[PDB]
């Protein structure tokens, strides 16, 4: 056959980043990179630097980057799927871990490599098949990723006593297993929930990752698969600061093993201020599809959106405190839509708000980035291919953010990052602090 | 009957703290309360202020305080159990929430009030009875607190749309339920695991909280119960910064409901750098009980501990970067031991290290707080009353830290604290930052 052996590459890359951080930290290390205010400290840590998350940086002129490789260079560069046009999430985890762009057989590797590592302990399987259909997917996804922790290699090698400098090699092995069992768990949370408890199927070492998943979800549409490949590539990662990424991080720094850290991250992503906004827009988009009715003019939604901005509401999906042009991940799923559902009524709706909304905002003071998110485009693209079941959308973001959160988990463990322990305070403390002192 | 109605008190206290924070933040609010370094930011946030956690402050001269009420004022002040000598965890949650010291019928209230709220959905019960006995308690405790999330009031009232200023009243209701179902869940993780899957029993509105628990654990010793009452009071809370407290906080700030935030906190407390040190000492204490043998002299453990400090090891349980005298929570369980197991061989072991260790360290440079933790005393006190099963110790700390973590959860939600979102960075970012800029 063929390849190049991921672990063995990462094995090489490690000492070189490990040093780079040793000198940096030697020399300028004490160079003050900012201040904290009594107000930030009530402000949920409002624009504090405190992380070092080495897999993605928000570029204000250019969206998000998976190195400096942004959005638009990824779609080019990342291997596409042996007869497709949209990237493999495989080759994206590979980029996130390596810093390098996969080769076809570096990706063909992972796919083989995920299919085998893809197995499920009879007790998560049982645990799923009895869960109540009143329990949310995301309470199931996280209940069962903890219960998968039964199987961690790290838990065990820890228990036996591996040493500091070896931690990555098994935290690696736990991550590669998790990202393989993930499709199974969610494919089954779907199937039990929404496709009347049927069988997820089997799993095919022939196919790539996203495919197997879509195939277990029970979807025969190769257009949907390639949306699945695209969706999973683009919601992977987003700086370290955000709830699901900071929790997998925080918790993972107590030397908790990847099953447990990831499950704790979904408990953050099931949180309304975090998971639920892909929905929020679809729902808005839904009332609007009624209130302003089917095939509107450029004049009537201008009337609606205007009568919306000014009568003391907001347009779900639009605006960004930093990013200066349109989010590339809107643009990616738009480019998709243009190709594959161009004359869709509801995509027609979204694509109209794109024409109209920015100017309406910009002209009406709510501005500086009046441009759309990702979250604005996606749900419309899900509902088209018949994924109506919108509570379940939060799991699909979960299975995606997995690649980005676990691929930095190996790195915090490789560069051997400390237990995360900011100082708390208390108001009475503070009152004596800033002013009285 | 009799009482005073907790929710209704807290209802009163709220606006007054709510303002106090409005003015403080009005005026000095921008007063800079510290700086951040490139080095802190790799240093897992090494002595950053970033939290406001209003239920406990570390006093360096005086241990931990549950206001300014420290250790020693609590044992006095907190109601003791209608024929006991050790405080009720009931009256401690009450202190943590109110800021005020319970009255007997404020506590008698909670006990009644926990017993009724104490019920368990048939699906967590099933989920427990089939869990594998190879799955850790703490992967079970957290799997089933997520699955209890099926029952959150907040989840629902959120779903229906309560408004900002009402959030506490239901986040309250979810917390009071959780702390009542907790005994049931852990009593059953024990029983299934270690007491051959037997029945937890029933639940008695007559008895107080810790009692019911010990009674479901299946322990007939009223000395053990009162250890249980003491244990649960003292490991409740410990500033906000620590893994289990920061995670329940972080995650709970994405508007996740208390079941989900607490379950995510245990995924942090199951982490080796966090849960597992109560054990670590018992295990040390165990080898020593052999290597230096039964009834040693003040001269021979001096030899051991000295031959330990100098031959390049450390004494599990001893030392503290801040606290200047002996941790009161050593002293609390020592005072206990003195009373109730005075002539215990292994307590004799601990109490000897107390005589010997500090001076041996102090004289041998490893000093400034050479004094013992809590974690040093507890496990010895557990093993005596026949709680041999030491993997399960992490759940008993869980059920304790619950009171302190949930009682500040109501407060972050009451004072309406924002989604927690520090800025990440990246090394390449940093290199350009501190020096190049």
From Swiss-Prot, chains A, B:
Give the reactions, separated by semicolons, that this protein catalyses: oxaloacetate + acetyl-CoA + H2O = citrate + CoA + H(+)
As for PTM, the annotation reads: Methylated. Trimethylation at Lys-368 by CSKMT decreases citrate synthase activity.
Carrying N6-succinyllysine, the residues are 49, 76, 166, 294, 300, 348, 366, 423, 432
What is the protein's known function?
Key enzyme of the Krebs tricarboxylic acid cycle which catalyzes the synthesis of citrate from acetyl coenzyme A and oxaloacetate.
The protein here is known as Citrate synthase, mitochondrial
Instruction: Give residue numbers for the modification (N6,N6,N6-trimethyllysine).
Output: 368
Among the Pfam families in the record, one is: Citrate_synt
Question: Major place of localization?
Answer: mitochondrion
* Active site, renumbered: 274, 320, 375
Key word Transit peptide present: yes
Record-level GO BP terms: carbohydrate metabolic process; citrate metabolic process; tricarboxylic acid cycle
Into which family does the record put it? Belongs to the citrate synthase family.
Give the record's keywords alphabetically.
Acetylation, Methylation, Mitochondrion, Phosphoprotein, Transferase, Transit peptide, Tricarboxylic acid cycle, Ubl conjugation
Cite any additional comment in the entry: Citrate synthase is found in nearly all cells capable of oxidative metabolism.
Q: What is its EC number?
A: 2.3.3.1
GO CC term, one of those recorded: mitochondrial matrix
Q: What are the Phosphoserine sites (modified residues) in this protein?
A: 199
Residues bound to oxaloacetate are: 329, 401, 421
Ubl conjugation as a keyword?
A: yes
Tell me which residues bear N6-acetyllysine: 49, 294, 300, 348, 355, 366, 432
The cellular location(s) given in this protein's UniProt record come to: Mitochondrion matrix
């Amino acid at each position: 056959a063929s390849s190049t052996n991921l672990k063995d590459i990462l094995a090489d890359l490690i000492p070189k980043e490990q040093a780079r951080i040793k000198t940096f930290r030697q020399q300028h290390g004490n160079t003050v990179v900012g201040q904290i205010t009594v107000d930030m400290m009530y402000g949920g840590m409002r624009g504090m630097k405190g992380l070092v998350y080495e897999t993605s940086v928000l570029d204000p002129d250019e969206g998000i980057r998976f190195r400096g490789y942004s959005i638009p260079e990824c779609q080019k560069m990342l291997p596409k799927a042996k007869g497709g046009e949209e990237p493999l999430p495989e080759g994206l985890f590979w980029l996130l871990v390596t810093g390098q762009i996969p080769t076809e057989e570096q990706v063909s590797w992972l796919s083989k490599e995920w299919a085998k590592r893809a197995a499920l302990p009879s007790h998560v399987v049982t645990m799923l098949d009895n869960f109540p259909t009143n329990l949310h997917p995301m309470s199931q996804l996280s209940a069962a990723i903890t219960a998968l922790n039964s199987e961690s290699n790290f838990a065990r090698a820890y228990a036996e006593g591996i040493h500091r400098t070896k931690y990555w090699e098994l935290i690696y092995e736990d991550c590669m297993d998790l990202i393989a069992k993930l499709p199974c768990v969610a494919a089954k949370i779907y199937r039990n929930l929404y496709r009347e408890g049927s069988s997820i199927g089997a799993i095919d070492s022939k196919l790539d990752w996203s495919h197997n998943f879509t195939n277990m979800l029970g979807y025969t549409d190769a257009q949907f698969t390639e949306l699945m490949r695209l969706y999973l590539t683009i919601h992977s990662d987003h700086e370290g600061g955000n709830v699901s990424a900071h929790t997998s991080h925080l918790v993972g720094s107590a030397l908790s093993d990847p099953y447990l850290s990831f499950a704790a991250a979904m408990n953050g992503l099931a949180g309304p201020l975090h998971g639920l906004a892909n929905q929020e827009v679809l729902v808005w988009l839904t009332q609007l599809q009624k209130e302003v009715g089917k095939d509107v003019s450029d004049e009537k939604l201008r009337d609606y959106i205007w009568n919306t901005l000014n009568s003391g509401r907001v347009v779900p999906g639009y605006g960004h405190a930093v990013l200066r042009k349109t989010d590339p991940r809107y643009t990616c799923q738009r480019e998709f839509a243009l190709k594959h559902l161009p004359h869709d009524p509801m995509f027609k709706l979204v694509a109209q708000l794109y024409k109209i909304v920015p100017n309406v905002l910009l002209e009406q003071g709510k501005a500086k980035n009046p441009w759309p998110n990702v979250d604005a485009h996606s749900g419309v693209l899900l509902q088209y291919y018949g994924m109506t079941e919108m509570n379940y959308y939060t799991v699909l973001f979960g299975v995606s953010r997995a690649l980005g959160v676990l691929a930095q988990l190996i790195w915090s463990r490789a560069l051997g990052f400390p237990l995360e322990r900011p100082k708390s305070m208390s108001t009475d403390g503070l009152i004596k602090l800033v002013d009285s002192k």
